[PDB]
Amino acid sequence: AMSQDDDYLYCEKCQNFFIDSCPNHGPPLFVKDSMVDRGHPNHSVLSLPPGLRISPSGIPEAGLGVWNEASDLPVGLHFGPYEGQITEDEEAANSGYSWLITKGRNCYEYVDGQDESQANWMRYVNCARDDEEQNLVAFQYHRKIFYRTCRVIRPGCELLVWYGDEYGQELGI
Amino acid sequence: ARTKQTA
Ligand SMILES: Nc1ncnc2c1ncn2[C@@H]1O[C@H](CSCC[C@H](N)C(=O)O)[C@@H](O)[C@H]1O
Ligand SMILES: [Zn+2]
Structure with a gap:
């Protein structure tokens, strides 16, 4: 199903899946991370795109978070890829910084952003608690x-x- | 169980 296929992007506004462009809205804008030498100790912070900022979260006791600063971010803006250490080790499942990546057919990997020197700024993005404060979909x-x-x-x-x-x-x- | 998962 196009719904469940890695090769396809999704347009929020149209509900269309496509490979290159939504036929109505054109190709999506992917924002680049900032350049930082691989392995830099503050890599995750320094990879942050211009216009954003890492500062304490507005969620109580939630540590740091990512705030928008420069200007309105439109719908359908794309960020990533989420960086980190790829591994099948299940202690990665518990870092709290890992996303499951489905390789299809009851097999999977973890990308673990726990290590700041290996992760990017997306590790600092906090979890929405209600659909009203959620402005990103992973x-x-x-x-x-x-x-x-x-x-x-x-x-x-x-x-x-x-x-x-x-x-x-x-x-x- | 602190594993982030997609739909
Ligand atoms: N909605 C929420 N409520 C409370 N804590 C949250 C949260 N969303 C994220 N967190 C916190 O952030 C962790 C996920 S990692 C996200 C970055 C983290 N806030 C940091 O300072 O590096 C969770 O273990 C939790 O402690
Ligand atoms: Zn569209």
């Missing part, structure tokens, strides 16, 4: 994870993504 594409904006994000708003139902229960949501 999804798998080309065997990797990306976040796309599912509403307009104004300056001064925290970016917030949904972690999946299992981790959400763990967070008390």
